[PDB]
């Protein structure tokens, strides 16, 4: 059961007696979308300061494990431990992250962390193609709007930061009205609330800055061509649904219909996905996957693919977009029936895995928007209630003759112009 109390800070807890671990954490409603192009990467630097050697050493001496996660809409700082020592994690979180920040922002520590983060971002930008392609897709989809800033930070901006930027961001965003205290695993809600009440655990006053511009989607493309690479990596997307939309689960199911494909695994060549019937003959791709990502203001629905067949890219894109076209007009009931159970198993593993850190992140990110956490059972009935008419109604609105965003790198010379791709979003025979 999920129990949430608004006394003090918003305290959420999900109790699981079977687990042998307990996680206690703080989730902030600010993310990479709350920063600007001149201090971009301040959140990643804060994360790596919390994860620095001295802080991690003092934590691990007591027997605790530290996790930090940076995203568009939230920042997560989690302390995981054994069930008997769940009170010690609160003490470490109070003493280190909240009460005092002078020790963590010393000159030498800041310089070392800055040099390590610069090295990491430099390695990412050159030797991680499928993920940086998705980052550029975000950066070109939401350009000149908060949601397009990369979460790690750019190489040029990360140099200009000083400790003053970090402390300014901490003053502006680490607030009581922006925070949720989350408890996961083998702990009780009453015990957690009592433990918080015994201490003060006050973060700050409130009134975080309000953004003047809301995120917007622009049809656009960016091409980063490099002929010294062996493949071509391509990510393509349209505007999707945000969190708290009525069509959220319909979006995830429509994504699940096409699924993912790996050419080298024997089993995934026999899937009921009809798209493979066009792909398999000439080995058009090595792998693809479909995504329905949702944020607070907007979302992305699309796919990502990698291939060595540098002379047949347009055929791959054409067949994929013709499979997308089929959703509006001629989706069949068996497709939806398979999609329901595939999605239920897909959602089942996500929310019911052994690791409590994923549960903590999900619960903290959920209560910061909805105000409450949807149960597993009520999720299934909405999934089971989906019909063919709903899928057709959603697809006729979100992907029929709509603008797209594209991002590719590698031997993308075979990738045709924008308009030729944009015309594939309709059939013209219907």
């Amino acid at each position: 059961e999920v129990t949430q109390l608004s006394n003090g800070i918003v305290v959420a807890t999900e109790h699981n007696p079977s687990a042998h671990t307990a996680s206690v954490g703080v989730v902030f409603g600010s993310g990479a979308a709350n920063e600007n192009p001149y201090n971009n990467g301040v959140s990643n630097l804060w994360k790596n300061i919390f994860l620095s050697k001295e802080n991690s050493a003092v934590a691990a001496k007591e027997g605790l494990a530290l996790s930090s996660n940076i995203s568009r809409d939230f920042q997560s700082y989690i302390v995981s431990s054994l069930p008997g020592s769940t009170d010690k994690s609160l003490d470490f979180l109070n003493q280190s992250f909240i009460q005092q920040k002078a020790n963590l922002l010393s000159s030498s520590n800041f310089e070392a962390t800055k040099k390590s983060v610069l090295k990491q971002v430099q390695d990412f930008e050159e030797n991680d193609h499928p993920n940086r392609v998705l980052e550029h897709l975000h950066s070109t989809a939401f350009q000149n709007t908060p949601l397009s800033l990369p979460t790690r930070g750019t190489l040029e901006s990360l140099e200009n930061l000083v400790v003053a930027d970090l402390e300014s961001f901490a003053n502006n965003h680490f607030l009581n009205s922006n925070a949720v205290v989350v408890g996961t695993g083998n702990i009780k809600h009453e015990d957690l609330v009592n433990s918080i009440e015994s201490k003060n655990l006050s973060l700050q006053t409130g009134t975080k800055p309000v953004l003047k511009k809301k995120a917007a989607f622009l049809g656009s493309e960016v091409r980063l061509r490099d002929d010294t690479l062996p493949k071509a990596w391509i990510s393509l997307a349209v505007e999707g649904e945000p969190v708290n939309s009525p069509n959220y689960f319909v979006a995830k199911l429509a994504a699940q219909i096409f699924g993912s494909y790996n050419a080298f695994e024997p089993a995934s060549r026999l899937q009921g996905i009809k798209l493979l019937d066009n792909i398999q003959e000439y080995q058009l791709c090595d792998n693809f996957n479909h995504f329905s990502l949702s944020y607070k203001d907007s979302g992305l629905w699309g796919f990502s693919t990698a291939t060595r067949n540098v002379t047949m890219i347009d055929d791959l894109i054409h067949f994929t977009l013709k499979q997308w076209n089929r959703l509006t007009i001629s989706v069949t009931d068996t497709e939806v029936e398979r999609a329901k159970s595939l999605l239920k198993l897909q959602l089942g593993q996500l929310y019911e895995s052994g690791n409590p850190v994923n549960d903590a992140n999900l619960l903290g990110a959920e209560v910061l928007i909805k105000g409450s956490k949807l149960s597993l059972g009520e999720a299934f009935k909405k999934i089971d209630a989906i019909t063919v008419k709903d899928v057709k109604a959603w697809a006729g609105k979100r992907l029929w003759d709509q603008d797209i965003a594209i991002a590719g790198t590698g031997q993308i010379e075979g990738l045709l112009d924008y308009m030729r791709i944009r015309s594939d979003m309709s059939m013209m025979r219907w």
Partner: peptide
Amino acid sequence: ALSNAAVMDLQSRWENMPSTEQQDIVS
């Protein structure tokens, strides 16, 4: 002084800038 990131190019950055964020710079 003041942090280099904030002051530099604080013209095109004046607009589309949070009101509470821009009231700290003048202090």
